[PDB]
């Protein structure tokens, strides 16, 4: 191999690749990036059986095509310390040479034959995503998902494709709370009418660093592959059946209150200084907040005026987990939110104001939560 | 007690005080701030036998004078979540009430009689510091000092007062390296001709957060007390005898090179990607840097042109610790530095260009380092 590349292009590519290396044992090929020069591109890839990323940068020049490998962490450590001028990469036996003017380095290469095959799939389902709605859904739902969940299928995010109705549902839950969204008017190409993909949390978080809009998503029911012009990402899927979240959603709600998002965030954080649970009291023109599981002798109270009177003929009391409530509000894009309730011992829902209104660019996430008793 | 205070004044005061609390066991008075209302001031103090801070803020109003205590971490957690409007603090039995409009809190107080006495000293030495030179010296020397040093006196920074010559010397060492500065034309008031104070590293780091210029420093040989208009800080001193650093400094140096600071930093970091030690080669118009304790098959080299020829008739080779060398350069305020050497196996010195030149506002730190063999 012998090429020259842009320092900043290379550094950026290496930064993305770090998350796909097992970096602690540098003597293992799992700590290495596979390199391949083909025509005017340098491809860099880091993968294992479970997950992987393949990227390219254009070469500034190319004298010799071929393949090699290099420790990804050391490679980035070197590049990040170099000048903003072009870098020469040239193989020399079992070794990769890096040169930039007066600076030169050598790093040992491993046998590229040991490097894992980067998978290709025969997709059963595919979508083209030309707006931020999918990663918006992912980012909004991620906090509810236990990565190290001890239950397999809940350790990931559900993507449920309905080809007939052209809707993709995105769901996360940790059994105390459940966040979901339904994305309509999605052009879904699928061999089956319905197909469900469960992406592991790690994959979710990596996707958020790599992608935003204008990418494809494809799956063969075993792997999911996401591609744009620069990147091809894959992840193994979680096998099994995600619980049907629809069966747990209440059919109707006795009461629905339209409330101020930022005032509630501010009030909940305030009581959270002394407790993890909060007693919320709703009156016609007031919202009261009191610390609930605070130590004896420690109390926090606050209230907020509600100018547009709630349909309440007598105080409604609701015990809530402060962190969950806050996270549900963080997932909302509107200045107001709707709190839908039945009995105080029953699950309640938090969602955007005008959730029913059609949106193009964004996902609207709703969160269903179990209350605290008393 | 009953007063009102400014939220931002209070929050700022509480932030400074956090470092002086043992925060993990909230049931201990060590986690508490002592409060005292005297006339139009609120004094807040956190201290133990070893170290402490006493601060004040002016009250916006004062209805009732008295004393109390409160958990400092909870207090700050509450205040930081409040609005930017005045806060009412009022004692109610064994409890402190905090009110801001619709928000109200209660926290339990402890018996103020258990709170440790804040010490006053009869100073044996005192200085008034009206320029940043002392904290500049402290900040520059701090990195060489082992806080958790297993040797008592080296676990702190030395302040050596010479009343006769009106000089204060500031020294830190960890036995591999030694950084020092001599501050001249300091008005020293002292009962003894010579007196040495050793401040613990923790105290050093706290001082850096609190003080910059226009403060007094006093010591009775047991405690050191630092005061400005807002703060009174104290620390117990480390007992014993700091080694005389003067006896270890070489008398003369065979060679002294004036070199580029930022070029050396950049070159050393570059080789540091692959090693912790570096072989430096000085020639008449070139400085060469090579990784030294890098793994087999991993190498890093770079060089820098030296336009103003060094007085060198044949290459000088010096083995150096990369981190120490970098830290010595970080402590310098000039664009160039002087490297003074004897034999390659002998200690060498790093200091500012024109170190001998008189400076008002700043400390000039020199670092003496043991080289690496080969």
Residue numbers in the entry:
A (entry chain A), B (entry chain A): 1 to 374
What did the study's authors say about this model?
In the space group P2 two monomers were present per asymmetric unit. However there is no significant difference observed between these two structures from different space groups, the structural alignment of both yielded an RMSD of 0.15 Å. As expected for a prokaryotic β-clamp, each monomeric unit of Hpβ-clamp consists of three domains. In Hpβ-clamp, domains I, II, and III were observed to span residues Met1to Phe118, Pro119 to Pro 250, and Lys251 to Leu374, respectively. Domain I comprised of nine antiparallel β-strands and two alpha helices, domain II having eight β-strands and two alpha helices, and domain III with eight β-strands and two helices. As seen in β-clamp from other organisms, Hpβ-clamp form a head-to-tail dimer, i.e., the N-terminus of one monomer interacting with the C-terminus of another monomer. Two salt bridges are formed between Glu266 and Glu298 of chain A with Lys83 and Lys74 of chain B, and another set of equivalent salt bridges also formed between Glu 266 of chain B and Lys 83 of chain A, and between Glu 298 of chain B and Lys 74 of chain A. These salt bridges and several hydrophobic interactions were observed to mediate the association between the monomers. Perhaps most notably, two major DNA-interacting loops of β-clamp were observed to adopt quite different conformations in H. pylori compared to the β-clamp in E. coli and the other organisms. The loop spanning residues 20 to 28 from domain I was found to be oriented in an opposite direction in the Hpβ-clamp structure compared to the corresponding loop in the clamp structures of other organisms. Despite the oppositely oriented loops, our superposition of Hpβ-clamp with DNA-bound Ecβ-clamp showed the side chain of Hpβ-clamp Lys23 (which corresponds to Arg 24 Ecβ-clamp) still to be in a position close to DNA, suggesting that Lys23 of Hpβ-clamp may participate in DNA binding and may be crucial for binding to DNA.
